[PDB]
Amino acid sequence: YDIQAWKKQCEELLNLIFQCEDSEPFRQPVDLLEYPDYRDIIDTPMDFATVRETLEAGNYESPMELCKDVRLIFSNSKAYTPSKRSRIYSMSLRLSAFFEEHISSVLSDYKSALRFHKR
Numbered sequence: 001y002d003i004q005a006w007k008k009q010c011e012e013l014l015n016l017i018f019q020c021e022d023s024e025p026f027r028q029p030v031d032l033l034e035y036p037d038y039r040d041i042i043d044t045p046m047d048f049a050t051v052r053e054t055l056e057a058g059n060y061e062s063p064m065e066l067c068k069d070v071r072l073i074f075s076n077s078k079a080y081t082p083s084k085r086s087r088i089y090s091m092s093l094r095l096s097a098f099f100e101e102h103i104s105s106v107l108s109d110y111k112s113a114l115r116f117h118k119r
């Protein structure tokens with residue numbers, strides 16, 4: 001029932017994500033010189049360094065907010081992909097499955113701790 005535990009759990013999960021080779025295209029903001037039309041398709045860029053920095057600055061109030069930004073990394077890749085078979089998109093799908101598998105207990109534990117706090 002620790003209402004704060006999610007933060008360190010998210011730091012450790014982001015550490016695992018940065019160790020994954022599949023996260024390399026998503027570690028830093030998309031380079032506009034490599035993908036000149038990126039902002040014509042994507043309204044809200046997001047990357048894992050921005051997520052980590054937001055967490056470390058104390059600018060997420062809950063793991064749901066972090067989860068919304070990580071999911072935006074994956075939806076941006078899906079929206080930008082020219083093909084559902086593209087290399088970078090395929091890496092995003094594996095990384096998304098890994099993230100979802102690990103974030104589920106973080107969200108469950110936080111929501112349960114918060115319900116206990118408000119009992």
Ligand SMILES: C[C@@H](CO)N(C)c1ncccc1F
Binds near residue numbers: 076077080087088089
């Ligand atoms: C990091 C993502 C964009 O959000 N990246 C550039 C791409 N995403 C999917 C397919 C091809 C790509 F090049």
